């Protein structure tokens, strides 16, 4: 189940993501459910002290993506990919934010 993964925080707010990333470093990140659009997920990513928020898009064929050119069957595959290459993100996904 997705909740097993430390990077997967479920329904947390944008402001909560700032708290969760407060003692993060470059590449600290979490995946969350978006309040601006439900069912939609987002990545909140820390880099040089700032948090950047990316929409995780769902394609018409079910694949997930941040960047249009790199789409995956599952969220785990998407996180794995962006942990090795930024590919549109400001930096790679490195350390999960601690859960609170």
């Amino acid at each position: 189940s997705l909740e097993k993964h430390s990077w997967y925080h479920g329904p947390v707010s944008r402001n909560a993501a700032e708290y969760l990333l407060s003692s993060g470093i470059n590449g600290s990140f979490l995946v969350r459910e978006s309040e601006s659009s439900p069912g939609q997920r987002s990545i909140s990513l820390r880099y040089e002290g700032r948090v950047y928020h990316y929409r995780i898009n769902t394609a018409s064929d079910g694949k997930l993506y941040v960047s249009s050119e790199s789409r995956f069957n599952t969220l785990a595959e998407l996180v794995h990919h962006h942990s090795t290459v930024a590919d549109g993100l400001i930096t790679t996904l490195h350390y999960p934010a601690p859960k609170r």
Binding site: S36, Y52, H53, Y54, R55, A86, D87, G88, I90, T91
Partner: protein, 101 residues
């Protein structure tokens, strides 16, 4: 009505050495809200693998090193901005083909 814009809008390239390029693009309008650029480069055609790096929004030039003399490369520059909802998005990117020598 979904829409996209081109940022950057002009891309210039020149060989610096047989193995490196100087590239430059136009500084963005403040209204474009750019936070960083992603530069990619790889061999021309066939959706071939690219190397990549990012520069901050305050840069409008970069160097690309470790190239093979004479080989055709495609260089692409992407701009990522932040929208009024506080989410990152990609402008439509600019690309050019070039080779040293």
């Amino acid at each position: 009505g979904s829409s996209v814009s081109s940022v950057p809008t002009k891309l210039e390239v020149v060989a610096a050495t047989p193995t490196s390029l100087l590239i430059s693009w136009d500084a963005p309008m403040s209204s474009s809200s750019v936070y960083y650029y992603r530069i990619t480069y790889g061999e021309t055609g066939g959706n071939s693998p690219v190397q990549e790096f990012t520069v901050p929004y305050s840069s409008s030039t970069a160097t690309i090193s470790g190239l093979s003399p004479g080989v055709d490369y495609t260089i692409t520059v992407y701009a990522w901005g932040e929208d009024s909802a506080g989410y990152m998005f990609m402008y439509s990117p600019i690309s050019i083909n070039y080779r040293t020598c």
